[PDB]
């Protein structure tokens, strides 16, 4: 007889866990694990002795965090108006899709114990924690403060954290570069919200002062800003006052 | 009483989100008394089952945390918990277990070290070291999984085999990482009453200068950890640009206050001769030369 | 006794002191311009 | 005799260093 | 330190051997004794050598182990020559650093080349110790000149390129 058999009579606890664990990991209610309080806490049932409960408390960190991220993604999918936050939500959805596929792989290969499950998903601790922390501040932070907040993480020394930060920053910053593209090429302003270093003044009654620069909002990753402003102003002047549409 | 796993309420980007300072007051399922069992094989299997969870830092039915371990204190978490073994275990099994328990202490200490020292205020060197610690933990769990598989299917498995396997496989690297981490904790708590990691590794490496495997591991760790510092130095000497805003780099360029901008623009000599400095604290012995 | 040499020792020391009196006074003027604002 | 000149030289070295440290302190505090 | 490293390796092998001897459920004490019998000489030799790890210095220890490589017993000479390789590697690393770059590594007195900080002239800051020259090293009087000339080249003439 193996070691695990001789202990069976003297050790009582509810493979059955692995039967209902995949449904709990995907942020869904289970016969033995039930969420409560708007999916902010998970109740471990009776008949799970000290050790297994202590181990599960580490595994269930992924389930609750993923459920919170899924709630955020489903809630703010098409409600936010700012382009920066929308791009952030897009990349967040992509990351969650990868996580779900990873879980499906971990449980397609029938696992032997809870520990192999924990080890398989272990590399996702930093990604999930970072995404939860950033999404937690999607409300108070404005369109530009959010971009600056993410940008500060691209310098993180940790390859995993900096990898996810620089992965998300590309798509988060693309809309800003689209604003700059429209301003540079045609000479027009797109951002309806205050998330750019060039603005207008409808109340003004003279050309040279309708457009003004905001030196405080100039991002660090942009270059030759004082030339971008002049290019855009001269374009507006040419295509709306001189009416030289051909050139 | 119901059991709940609830969400807890320079930001710590890797600090545990859920509550983990919960210590169970009494066992949820009352197991057999250890004194009641007299057979040696049964005791060995029971202690093995309890030990698999202990090695990850969790409590068991027969291995319990010492009353001195307070999760609130930072130093207590960093140094890891101390375990007490039930008095009714067999003497030989008790000794062998007391040797193996230390591995759970190191693992818990490293896991709590990551959740504290991996933020922006501790610099790129410490962050990159936390990366190594997290990769080592991932490797160590594959040593624990194999042990569990052998316990489950191998009939010849016994406590001595576990002791020999763990000691001969993972003891050395774990000891190195834990010692470096605890030394960093001691130094950083002393300084409150960054680039210092390289000094700790170099100081640590003097004692293992004759040991091939330990020297190889320490040299590899030093090489990967220092790579960020080499990046800063390379950019400084090739393009004259300082990049990382953590003030880690030795050549400290400082911003002129807005109140004096007009003054410093006129007298650019003082701008270019006073607002570039050399941070002597973070210098290695290679750069400890005036002309260099 | 200290060896005599073709180069004037006292001249070198005196020039060093004068160059140390120019740096001091220029630094003082700059600090005065900095403090009063 | 020249000992006296050397002594004054070192005294002015210290005074210059103090002035530079004063500049650094002032700039650090203003920031 | 290298001696302790090889000692740890040997102890690990001994523990694995014991685990093999008791995995095969033994019938009596005598089969156990016979299974581990070939370890009498190795354990006695290791205990005797480790017993003198304190009084013996860095170089006297190396010379003490080196004298056992000539033992006629295949088992004793086998373990002595096995341990001597890793024990002598650090000495050859000191010699490597001295030969190639031209710098002294040993902080302790375990090498036949030393310095004199109190001296105020190049040719006599570095001196040789003919008593400490090991038997297994060759062309020592050429090693000394190679190292001295390299120190001279890379610190006085400042010819770093070549």
From TrEMBL, chain A:
<feature type="domain" description="Gamma tubulin complex component protein N-terminal">
    <location>
        <begin position="19"/>
        <end position="247"/>
    </location>
</feature>
<comment type="similarity">
    <text>Belongs to the TUBGCP family.</text>
</comment>
<protein>
    <recommendedName>
        <fullName>Spindle pole body component</fullName>
    </recommendedName>
</protein>
TrEMBL record, chain B:
<protein>
    <recommendedName>
        <fullName>Spindle pole body component</fullName>
    </recommendedName>
</protein>
<feature type="domain" description="Gamma tubulin complex component protein N-terminal">
    <location>
        <begin position="48"/>
        <end position="292"/>
    </location>
</feature>
<comment type="similarity">
    <text>Belongs to the TUBGCP family.</text>
</comment>
TrEMBL record, chain D:
<protein>
    <recommendedName>
        <fullName>Mto2p-binding domain-containing protein</fullName>
    </recommendedName>
</protein>
UniProtKB/TrEMBL annotation, chain E:
<protein>
    <recommendedName>
        <fullName>Spindle pole body component</fullName>
    </recommendedName>
</protein>
<comment type="similarity">
    <text>Belongs to the TUBGCP family.</text>
</comment>
């Amino acid at each position: 007889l193996t070691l695990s058999q001789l202990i069976e009579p003297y050790y009582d606890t509810l493979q059955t866990i692995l039967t209902y664990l995949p449904y709990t990991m995907l942020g869904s209610d289970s016969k033995i694990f039930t969420f409560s309080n708007n999916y902010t806490r998970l109740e471990i049932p009776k008949d799970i002795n000290n050790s297994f409960s202590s181990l599960l408390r580490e595994v269930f960190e992924f389930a609750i965090l993923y459920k919170q991220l899924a709630i955020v993604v489903d809630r703010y999918k098409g409600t936010l108006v700012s382009a920066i936050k929308t791009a952030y939500i897009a990349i967040l959805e992509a990351q969650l899709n990868k996580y779900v596929n990873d879980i499906n792989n971990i449980f397609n290969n029938k696992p032997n114990s809870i520990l192999v499950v924990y080890n398989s998903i272990f590399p996702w601790i930093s990604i999930l924690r970072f995404l939860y922390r950033v999404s937690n501040r999607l409300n108070r932070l404005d369109g530009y403060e959010f971009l600056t907040f993410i940008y500060s993480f691209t310098n993180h020394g940790d390859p995993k954290i900096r990898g996810i930060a620089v992965t998300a920053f590309t798509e988060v910053v693309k809309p800003y570069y689209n604003i700059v593209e429209h301003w540079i090429v045609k000479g027009e302003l797109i951002d309806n919200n205050n998330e750019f270093f060039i603005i207008f003044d409808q109340e003004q009654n003279e050309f040279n002062s309708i457009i003004k620069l905001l030196p405080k909002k100039i991002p660090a990753f942009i270059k030759s800003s004082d030339k971008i402003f002049q290019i855009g102003k001269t374009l507006i002047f040419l295509n709306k006052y001189c009416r030289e549409l051909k050139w | 009483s119901p059991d709940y796993v609830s969400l807890r309420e320079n930001l710590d980007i890797m600090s545990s989100c859920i509550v983990d300072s919960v210590i169970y007051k009494s066992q949820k399922i009352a197991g057999p008394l250890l004194s009641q069992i007299s057979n040696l094989n049964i005791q060995q299997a029971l202690i093995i089952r309890e030990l698999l969870f202990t090695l990850l830092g969790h409590e068991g039915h027969y291995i319990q945390y010492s009353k001195r371990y307070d999760p609130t204190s930072q130093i207590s978490r960093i140094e890891g918990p101390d375990y007490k073994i039930a008095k009714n275990l067999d003497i030989s099994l008790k000794v062998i277990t007391k040797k193996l328990v230390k591995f759970g202490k190191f693992y818990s200490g490293l896991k709590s070290f990551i959740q504290v020292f991996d933020n922006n205020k501790f610099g790129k060197i410490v962050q990159k070291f936390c990366s190594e610690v997290r990769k080592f933990l991932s490797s160590y769990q594959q040593v624990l999984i194999n042990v569990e598989h052998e316990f489950k299917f191998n009939k010849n498995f016994n406590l001595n085999m576990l002791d020999s396997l763990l000691h001969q496989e993972i003891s050395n690297e774990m000891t190195h990482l834990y010692q470096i981490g605890i030394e960093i904790s001691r130094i950083t708590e002393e300084r409150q009453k960054g680039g210092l990691l390289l000094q700790v590794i170099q100081e640590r490496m003097v004692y293992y200068k004759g040991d091939p495997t330990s020297l190889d591991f320490l040299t590899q760790l030093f090489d990967i950890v220092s790579s960020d510092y080499i990046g800063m130095l390379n950019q400084w000497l090739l393009e004259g640009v300082i990049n990382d805003p953590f003030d880690e780099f030795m050549i400290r360029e400082k911003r002129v206050p807005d109140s004096f901008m007009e003054i410093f623009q006129s007298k650019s000599e003082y701008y270019w001769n006073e607002l570039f400095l050399i941070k002597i604290d973070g210098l290695l012995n290679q750069f400890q030369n005036s002309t260099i | 006794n200290i060896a005599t040499t073709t180069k004037s020792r006292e001249e070198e020391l005196n020039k060093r002191i004068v160059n140390y009196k120019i740096q001091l006074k220029l630094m003082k003027n700059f600090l005065q311009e900095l403090i009063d604002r």
